[PDB]
Amino acid sequence: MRQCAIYGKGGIGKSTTTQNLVAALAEMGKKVMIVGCDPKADSTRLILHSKAQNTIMEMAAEAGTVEDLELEDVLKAGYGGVKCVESGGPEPGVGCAGRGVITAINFLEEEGAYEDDLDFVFYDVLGDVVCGGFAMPIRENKAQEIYIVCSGEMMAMYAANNISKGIVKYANSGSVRLGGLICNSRNTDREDELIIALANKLGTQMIHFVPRDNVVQRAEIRRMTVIEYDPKAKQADEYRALARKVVDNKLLVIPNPITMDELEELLMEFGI
Amino acid sequence: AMRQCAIYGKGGIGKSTTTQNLVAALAEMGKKVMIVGCDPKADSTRLILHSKAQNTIMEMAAEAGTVEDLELEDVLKAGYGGVKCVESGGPEPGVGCAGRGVITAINFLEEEGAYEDDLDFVFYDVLGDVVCGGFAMPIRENKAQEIYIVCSGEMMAMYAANNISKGIVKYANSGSVRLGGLICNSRNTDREDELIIALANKLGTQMIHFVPRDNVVQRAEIRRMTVIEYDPKAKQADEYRALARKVVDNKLLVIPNPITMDELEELLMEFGIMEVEDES
Amino acid sequence: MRQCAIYGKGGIGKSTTTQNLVAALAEMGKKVMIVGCDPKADSTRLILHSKAQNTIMEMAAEAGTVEDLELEDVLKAGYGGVKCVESGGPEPGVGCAGRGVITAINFLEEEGAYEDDLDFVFYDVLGDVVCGGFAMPIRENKAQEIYIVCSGEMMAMYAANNISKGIVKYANSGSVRLGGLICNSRNTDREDELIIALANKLGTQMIHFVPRDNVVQRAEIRRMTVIEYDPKAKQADEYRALARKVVDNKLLVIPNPITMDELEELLMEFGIME
Amino acid sequence: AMRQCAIYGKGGIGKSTTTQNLVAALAEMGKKVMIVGCDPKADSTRLILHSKAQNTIMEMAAEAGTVEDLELEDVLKAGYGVKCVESGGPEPGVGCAGRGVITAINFLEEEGAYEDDLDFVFYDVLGDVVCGGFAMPIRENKAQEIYIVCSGEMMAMYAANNISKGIVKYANSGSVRLGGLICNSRNTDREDELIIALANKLGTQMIHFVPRDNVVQRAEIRRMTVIEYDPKAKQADEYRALARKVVDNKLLVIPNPITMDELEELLMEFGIMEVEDESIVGK
Amino acid sequence: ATIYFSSPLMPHNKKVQAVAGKRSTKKGVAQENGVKIPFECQDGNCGSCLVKITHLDGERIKGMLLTDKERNVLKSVGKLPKSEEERAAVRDLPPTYRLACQTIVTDEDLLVEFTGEPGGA
Amino acid sequence: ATIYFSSPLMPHNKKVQAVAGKRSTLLGVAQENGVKIPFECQDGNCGSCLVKITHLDGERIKGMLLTDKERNVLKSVGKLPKSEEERAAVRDLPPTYRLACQTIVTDEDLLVEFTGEPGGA
Amino acid sequence: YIGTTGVNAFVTMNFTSDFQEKDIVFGGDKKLAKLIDEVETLFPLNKGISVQSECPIGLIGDDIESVSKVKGAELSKTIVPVRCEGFRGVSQSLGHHI
Amino acid sequence: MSREEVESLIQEVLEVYPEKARKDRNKHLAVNDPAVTQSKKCIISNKKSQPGLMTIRGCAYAGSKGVVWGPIKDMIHISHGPVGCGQYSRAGRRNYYIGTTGVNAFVTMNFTSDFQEKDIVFGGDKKLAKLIDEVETLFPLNKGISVQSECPIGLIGDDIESVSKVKGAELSKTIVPVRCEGFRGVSQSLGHHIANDAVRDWVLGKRDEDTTFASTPYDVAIIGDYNIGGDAWSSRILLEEMGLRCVAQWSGDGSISEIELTPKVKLNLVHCYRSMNYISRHMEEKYGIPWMEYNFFGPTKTIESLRAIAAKFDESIQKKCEEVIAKYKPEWEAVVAKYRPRLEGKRVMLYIGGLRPRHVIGAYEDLGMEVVGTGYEFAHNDDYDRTMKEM
């Protein structure tokens, strides 16, 4: 069993990239588990074909406490035999927004949903802020591999740098490593090698470059994921190649943070 | 008279630039205002002092023994005709709460008494991605009298504005915190002015002037300078000026009406941003 | 302006190897400084020609306090390039035995002994246990490079493992890294490849293999370094090569700790332990 | 009815093997003995429990949260008829390495392992450096009789001198005394008489001299004491003699520490180091 | 009952005298003396009021009841280890971390530490 | 003066009453109540009696004199930031870390924490 | 037990404050002090007093500890206040601990 | 001028001392540079005196009993310990006051326990209680008792706080124990600190739950003026002529009631920063009372301080301040015209305790004199920060 997490700022195609990754992995006979560590209840809509999967926090609130919660109502199986967990946050302004992640991980460990011959577990974690229950997988050594989804925008690169700093802080206390930098395109000039340069600057390797196209939206309307919407699509094969590079990845390194002026100069000398 | 404003919104849509240009216009109009940058990346004061990312309160506090040893002048700097700037900063990633710097900086400024009598406007530039934590500290502790949410035509900004309004309505009873309006920063997408107008009407609040996109903002940014004083004769300078007069003359402070995610989806659908969803 | 620490179990020839390295670096146009953090003030005997260099804390107690103490009094240049300071230690049972190291380092930073002319700073530090003042160079990022002197004896590799764990614990604090392992050899079979394998399993590299010699006893009765005594002796050129490898080192790694059973099975396969 | 004893010395000379063999010999005489390993290496109960390593008190306290919840049964392990406990130590680089000792003995005293249901209590303490934790059994009057293991090595007798300095420092507030010196062979020709002279200078005696026997490795390969492995070997006889003279030891004196020059001249006297001269310093 | 409030936000630790057993909780005591503990709920389900309680008089420790809601909230923010949960269940002894809105003042001397952030970092 | 001794070695923190300003120091108070703070010298230079002192009543903080011997020992231990030295030198306010053998009890409520190790880890 | 009931032994007796609505609204502590004075007046051979609190005592908000201390110092006799309210604890088990 | 000459003079003077004394005393002598903002890099202060060098500093008992607590007139101050300490400080300081001594005022009278050998061996707590009783019977009109402890009190381990609490509860009186032993601290500064702490802990927080006193928006309290020869009265007439109302006086001609009424004051006017900055900071932190430092030495400093104080109120106070300045201008103009030509160009050297070396510089410069050398016995580094610019 391999524990991987997907981080990065919100709005960069994180959820759909993770969904295509796991569906592609399930196409090969592997069995995967999804834990949505994003307060938005959208991390598992494209593999279950639902309006919004009911979150663990909502069920715990409606069923009194989390001790009355049953595994069958929170663990839903979708296409390819994937196991789906959805960790909703509390209302804005009501305590820490990361209590849902801690509660869900503790519940999953208590009910034993990990040892059931799984091979891949994927934590779709919000990366805008690394704190509370969002830094909890790094704090508790839950996700051994971490991938950051970024683009050629200042916010995305800063989020990647912050997550790298968070990895560095807890490097000595466990085997939490940054596998690579997933790159998503917004149809801008000179973006692929910008991200390759960032990855080489902070020690990792670029995993795969995902271009922007309209097929994923047409699949999104049908509450459908791209691969099993149309397996012969070019983007479907690109997602398959991304999955192949993820599973056959053996480089695990400890990154080095880059300063604000370094990132500014890197962005400036590449034409943006 | 001691008007306190907060600027919320999703990270990366232009809260810092809009706040700095607004403050430049207000200072141009002979109003002594003060900027508090409560965003963890600490660049809310770059275009005022023109030097660099101003050293935050947390950096001196760590360098000194305590937040009391820190001097008021050390963190509260002056630029653009006496306009004052303080920067909150934040802890190291994965340590504590990212909003701790906001609480520390506000407590420090309150204790030293930087909120002088001759101040007319205090603008907090804060991060709106997560309402919780110290980012909810201005609302919960009535630090910010009125809030403006910057927004765009994207889903994420719309949802962030909804969450900020949810926080405002949750803490409305215990303080004078109220919503003033919404500012639409343009991504040059089609049918976005009426989109933000529709969301503002749904929330029950009016809509602060919409700012179109252009490349003069980057031209002023490269020189570490605001658009207003790089080219006061441009349409952008008077654009930010008009937004400023509407800010000063704003009087509609209402309790918003947060809407459901399904209402957000249908309101994106009706303007063509989100495609029509068919159950079959 | 590079800082290196020499760590290892007491009785491993740490002081002698450090002084020979210093003397080999001095001749090649380099001004370096030795600091002996071992409670014994013998880390600078082979340089200063002295019987026992007066430690910092001895004189600090004699002169009332550290504030009334002068840099010229502790910083004696036995050789023109080399500069030696002795930290000293307290009487046994009196407080932490490493607080002298903290006092010495703070004194040197206060009086600016690290200015404008130092190519190398060496800290001959006690490695039998890493804690307090002895862990201070690793903890306070005082010594960027760390070299462990070890032999084939089980306790030498155990001390090396402890030092590696200590470096790992403060890896994120600063640039403190393990730069290599040093082989001080006793007349026993299968020693070089032993700590070579230890180096590969630690993720580090073995620097040099320094065997036993009779010239070291002649040097100690001479009270001078071997290179100073007999620069034509084979161990003199060997120390020269060790210093050359130290200067031209480029790879510094975060070590990997080794469990008790794994080191035990290594010693099993080599047969040093039955 | 309880004789509290400690074994000190520089790490790597054979404190653990000598201590375990002494306890094994004592258990043959019907005595009930208990072992405390105050050394961070945590291997002083290996040859008695036949195990790979006894779990330390600090390890149990970390896995259970605190030391107050810890039981005696999982901490005290009875093998060969004698009880065994391990102090352990903290992670190298943080805290004081001797802190585990302070955590262990205290805990024991509050749980009742220190009640006089035993004839002998022994502390295998690391004596390479004398600081807090490793000098706590001397400072807190928890070890009546101290025995120093020493070889014909400069470092070993330096450690003996340091431990004697600690003992004489804490001689006026308690009954901590030096019971003798134990010599383990380093294949040195003049080491026996060397440490004889050292003990005479310090005002103490040799309890015994232990020959270097290759059968001790053959006993350790089974995780076994040499007394049980060959009851009929001469090494077992030497260990039994050491035990009987430890029991019959009545000379408990406050030591007289010597200086560095005295130690240097004692090394010179027996040929371990050559003759130093002042006219041959600069060549 | 004597309570000493401590916080990095507070320039000085504050000593207050409180009446034990009141229906109003430690949150009432904090609010009367102007101690800024974040209270962001009225049902005791958030973790905003997390504090660290130290019993200065170790001999005078009073047995209490750890409510199921408080236990679940403390576990939700990861501030309740298994050993302390078992101690509360068996010996009826309080844990180190408490919730101000759910903490009933007892007749002893207490030190209440808070950092100004909601429970769960 | 009310002193609360706390330590991981002590199962429970102890509350003791002490006479302020006594020639006998905090060490006298610790010894007469059986609190095992490691004292290892008689000239006040070892630093093994290092403790962390917290004034529970922030209002009732009494100005004191930080002698040069204490300052030098604390620097040799490392438990003395430059900011605390400046505060003690200018405002005559005690530092966070003190030496029990050289600390005079003042008329206030104090919390004294020690780890059982000599000063300097 | 062995004793003269009502003189030096009071096991089968029932001493109660008998709270009314005006006690529920306006304090109740001064009633406790007056009750202690009356108990000392009418039962001089007692060797102590305990005040076992019932449910409303904690709910309305009362400091029986200060009354116990003051009256014990004034009358030189031990007064033990016991916050044994019914709602505290799930059963009789916590009453033993209190 | 002659800065190098000054440094050479310092070096030559320091030559007689032994090595330790010379090294320590080199840090305490400096050449003034007005551009320096932090004195720590130029001069060192607030350190122990070198033994056997004839220092001029006092003890903490002098700074506490003799300086702060002494001027309070309606209280009775007991010099707890041997007889000499009270004798040498009796009426040696000219802190003027109004009252009938021995009946309702006790400034110039020496109360002492007069410790003997049996007092040292056994203790003086019972003797202290008996003394308090005798004071109560013999001086009924006293409005408070303060017990200033001397060296043997803290050296033998007496519990005067418990005695003070017991006697204050018994007699319904304010009894203030001050632990101002001479060996505590290196000079009178720690005596000032201890006296301020005692005032804060036992006196200040008394009229906190009452509101009978009628407050006025023009309420000021003089802090750190001890009426040496009547200085506080001149300052008071100058302030009242401005229209402000002075409620408290710390502590020259001061009363316990004024100290208790101080927390109901709008503005604190601190004259002596060194001795009473602690209580002013405590007041600002607790009651929210702003405090500001003023200077009434000479006409220039007086006018500047008057304008600064008036700037904190409405325009009527400013107009009254201008009226006062206009009224008092001709008097000091005539004084200057009479005396300046006789004193013009003279060089003056100063060495006083604290805040007087810098305060009187303006007065000297108003007559044409120039200060060439100044210094302090017990000022801290902030005082040197303040006095670098003025020299």
Ligand SMILES: Nc1ncnc2c1ncn2[C@@H]1O[C@H](COP(=O)(O)OP(=O)(O)O)[C@@H](O)[C@H]1O
């Ligand atoms: N490869 C892609 N091509 C085109 N659009 C994409 C692609 N990946 C993501 N997007 C768009 O980006 C948005 C990101 O939303 P989603 O991935 O659901 O959550 P998050 O905001 O966390 O990334 C989606 O609405 C989707 O339409």
Ligand SMILES: Nc1ncnc2c1ncn2[C@@H]1O[C@H](COP(=O)(O)OP(=O)(O)O)[C@@H](O)[C@H]1O
């Ligand atoms: N009014 C605007 N028009 C066009 N671009 C803008 C405008 N405001 C900001 N930007 C661009 O947005 C980028 C970052 O915006 P910024 O203000 O840093 O986001 P945040 O609000 O998260 O701080 C800048 O590079 C700038 O060029």
Ligand SMILES: Nc1ncnc2c1ncn2[C@@H]1O[C@H](COP(=O)(O)OP(=O)(O)O)[C@@H](O)[C@H]1O
């Ligand atoms: N290269 C070598 N050849 C022979 N003997 C050596 C060599 N290096 C060190 N030694 C011996 O090892 C002993 C330990 O020396 P020293 O460094 O003073 O002790 P420590 O390593 O404990 O500081 C010395 O007596 C020396 O003779």
Ligand SMILES: Nc1ncnc2c1ncn2[C@@H]1O[C@H](COP(=O)(O)OP(=O)(O)O)[C@@H](O)[C@H]1O
């Ligand atoms: N009496 C002995 N004869 C021969 N070798 C011994 C004897 N005692 C110990 N040794 C050897 O010394 C090595 C290490 O000794 P050990 O007891 O671990 O040192 P310490 O005294 O630090 O515990 C062991 O591998 C063992 O083989």
Ligand code: ICS
């Ligand atoms: S209180 Fe101080 S020694 Fe500030 S102890 Fe001393 S009546 Fe002096 S320089 Mo006498 S810090 Fe007052 C003083 Fe100045 S007694 Fe007077 S003149 S302004």
Ligand code: CLF
């Ligand atoms: S420093 Fe201060 S004034 Fe000095 S004694 Fe101490 S409290 Fe007092 Fe008074 S009595 Fe005489 S003069 Fe002293 S020797 Fe004994």
Ligand code: SF4
């Ligand atoms: S730690 Fe992060 S998620 Fe938790 S309250 Fe603070 S900002 Fe919000």
Ligand code: SF4
């Ligand atoms: S930390 Fe190390 S050197 Fe210091 S007392 Fe403890 S064992 Fe000795």
Ligand code: FES
């Ligand atoms: S205020 Fe939410 S748990 Fe107490």
Ligand code: FES
């Ligand atoms: S007992 Fe050694 S410094 Fe205090």
Ligand SMILES: [Mg+2]
């Ligand atoms: Mg998503």
Ligand SMILES: [Mg+2]
């Ligand atoms: Mg910003």
Ligand SMILES: [Mg+2]
């Ligand atoms: Mg050596």
Ligand SMILES: [Mg+2]
């Ligand atoms: Mg051992």
